[PDB]
């Protein structure tokens, strides 16, 4: 059956931009530690230059209805259009939020999109909406669907801004179509999956593959 997105799954938020008469795919990314601001990591040239995908992965922590979220703030589900989702950054464990600052010069009504340490408030909650009439509110979000993300706290879209020379991501009143491509759903216990950090041991001899120590003559 057509695959659906569920909470605790891992996704990358992906958009596409036409640059020099060529379609280019980009993923939302953020370091978290040292820089809370989100940026766009291209992924169309993966054959020649691998993308830094470790920091583009988000986990769907929760997905409530709007009224349920209101009650929660006052005090493996399947995502449905019109629900509000919480996205946790896999690396830093911060949450994708609409910031109250703005460094943009092209747009005077845009806010910065970045990571936020805690999941308190409404800044970290986003509502999904169908991009086309093919889907409608209450329908299940289907893998590979283009959807529009709206901030719960600011009523702004997750927007790709090309006004300046470079591609940037902000929260504005213009809309952009994003894809929540799944990275992983659920792993059988004890089995290796891609995108994992691990050690490569020589058989069972307590010897691992490595590079030279920092400040070595071989340049590591």
């Amino acid at each position: 059956e057509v695959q659906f997105l569920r909470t605790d799954d891992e996704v990358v938020l992906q958009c596409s931009a036409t640059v020099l008469k060529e379609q280019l795919k980009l993923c939302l990314a953020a370091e978290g530690f040292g820089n809370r601001l989100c940026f766009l990591e291209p992924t169309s040239n993966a054959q020649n230059v691998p993308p830094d995908l470790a920091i583009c992965c988000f986990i769907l922590e929760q997905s409530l209805s709007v009224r349920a979220l209101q009650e929660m703030l006052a005090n493996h589900r399947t995502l449905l259009y019109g629900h509000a989702i919480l996205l946790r950054h896999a690396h830093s464990r911060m949450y994708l939020s609409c910031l109250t600052t703005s460094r943009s010069m092209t747009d005077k009504l845009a806010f910065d999109v970045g990571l936020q340490e805690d999941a308190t408030g409404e800044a970290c909650w986003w509502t999904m909406h169908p991009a086309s009439k093919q889907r409608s509110e209450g329908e299940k979000v289907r893998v590979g669907d283009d959807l529009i993300l709206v901030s719960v706290s600011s009523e702004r879209y997750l927007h790709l801004s090309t006004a300046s020379g470079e591609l940037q991501v902000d929260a504005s009143f213009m809309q952009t179509l994003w894809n929540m491509n799944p990275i992983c759903s659920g792993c059988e216990e004890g089995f290796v999956t891609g995108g994992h950090v691990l050690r490569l041991f020589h058989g069972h001899m307590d010897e691992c593959l490595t590079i030279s120590p920092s400040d070595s003559d071989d340049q590591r």
Partner: protein, 49 residues
């Protein structure tokens, strides 16, 4: 293939392109135009059926 039920993608045989809609040109929605030029594209969109 069934009427109404089946959802079909149209493909140009020789080139392999897919029948889709051109990216809605600007200022046309502003005037009020609600027709989208159809094009043949290499990938298309998910709602091309």
């Amino acid at each position: 293939i069934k009427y109404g039920e089946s959802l079909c993608f149209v493909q140009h045989v020789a080139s392999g392109l897919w029948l889709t809609y051109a990216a809605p040109d600007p200022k046309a929605l502003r005037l009020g135009v609600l027709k989208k030029k159809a094009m043949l594209h290499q990938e298309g969109h998910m709602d091309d059926a």
